[PDB]
């Protein structure tokens, strides 16, 4: 009732915030990530390297969020930790996020999302592209919210399902507020 109506509202706000961030990224000359470092790499190699890195970066951040929300409830067994992480980084989950954000086949969608995450993070380290790091953080947060909401509806933990859904929804609502306010401050510059 309250959670399923909020979940629908969350998907709209996530789309709006992520679309707004990404629309300003496409104004940046650095946006074509595959054509950088041309004296040292190629388009195909950049795509594999960014996907290589994005894979591990997503994996680490997803692991951190699983711990963040599940360790509070001792009723939850360790199977759900690995279960949730697997559910969060699998290509089907990433492809759903691909579709929700209208980024553009099963396997390609996940690879593209991973390459985008990794490319954005690496760009923010090698250039000034703090907007690109903001997008990667918000994209992973939306990936975790999307995954965990689905996962805990299919695999409700003992007694605390609605409370941990509320924790994740409250957390993600605050992140969306933070990402929105960061975007306006960066764009009101």
Work out how close the CB of 9 gets to a second copy at its nearest, in angstroms, rounded to a whole number.
Answer: 31
| Residue 127, annotated as binding a ligand | no
| Residue 28, annotated as binding a ligand | no
| Residue 44, annotated as binding a ligand | no
Task: Report DSSP state, residue 36.
Answer: S
Contacts with Mn ion by CB under 5 A lie at 55, 111, 114
| Residue 55, annotated as binding a ligand | yes
Work out how close the CB of 74 gets to a second copy at its nearest, in angstroms, rounded to a whole number.
Answer: 5
Alpha-carbon dihedral angle through residues 79, 166, 171, 136, given to the nearest 10 degrees: 60
178 binds, among a second copy, Mn ion, none (CB under 5 to 8 A by kind): none
If the CB atoms of residues 91 and 182 are measured against Mn ion, the closer one turns out to be 91
Work out how close the CB of 91 gets to Mn ion at its nearest, in angstroms, rounded to a whole number.
Answer: 8
Residue position matching structure tokens 């998907």: 11
Q: Extract long-range pairs of 174-179: CB within 8 Å, 24+ residues apart.
A: 175/138, 175/141, 176/10, 176/13, 176/14, 176/17, 176/138, 179/17, 179/21, 179/134, 179/137, 179/138, 179/141
C-alpha dist (Å) from residue 182 to 2, 23, 44, 99, 145: 28, 15, 33, 25, 20
Contacts with a second copy by CB under 8 A lie at 37, 39-41, 45, 48-49, 52-53, 55-57, 59-60, 62-64, 66-67, 71-74, 77-78, 81-82, 85, 122
If the CB atoms of residues 73 and 178 are measured against a second copy, the closer one turns out to be 73
Work out how close the CB of 11 gets to Mn ion at its nearest, in angstroms, rounded to a whole number.
Answer: 25
Q: Helix count (H) and strand count (E) of the chain?
A: 7, 0
If the CB atoms of residues 161 and 180 are measured against a second copy, the closer one turns out to be 161
Q: How many CA atoms are closer than 13 Å to the CA of 13, on its beta-carbon side?
A: 21
81 binds, among Mn ion, a second copy, none (CB under 5 to 8 A by kind): a second copy
If the CB atoms of residues 28 and 59 are measured against a second copy, the closer one turns out to be 59
- Annotated binding-site residues read 51, 55, 111, 114
């Amino acid at each position: 009732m309250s959670s399923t109506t909020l979940h629908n509202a969350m998907q709209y706000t996530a789309f709006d915030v992520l679309s707004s961030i990404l629309n300003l990224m496409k104004a940046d000359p650095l946006y074509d990530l595959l054509q950088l470092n041309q004296a040292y790499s190629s388009q195909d190699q950049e795509y594999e390297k960014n996907e290589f890195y994005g894979d591990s970066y997503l994996e680490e951040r997803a692991s951190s969020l699983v711990l963040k929300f599940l360790r509070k409830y001792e009723q939850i067994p360790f199977e759900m930790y690995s279960g949730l992480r697997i559910h969060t980084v699998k290509n089907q989950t990433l492809g759903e996020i691909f579709d929700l954000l209208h980024l553009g086949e099963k396997k390609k969608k996940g690879d593209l999302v991973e390459s985008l995450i990794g490319g954005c993070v690496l760009l923010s380290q090698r250039e000034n592209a703090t907007l690109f790091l903001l997008f990667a953080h918000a994209l992973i947060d939306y990936i975790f919210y999307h995954s965990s909401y689905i996962y805990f509806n299919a695999n409700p933990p003992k007694l605390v399902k609605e409370e941990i859904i509320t924790d994740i929804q409250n957390w993600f609502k605050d992140k969306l507020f933070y990402y929105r306010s960061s975007l306006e401050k960066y764009q009101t510059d």
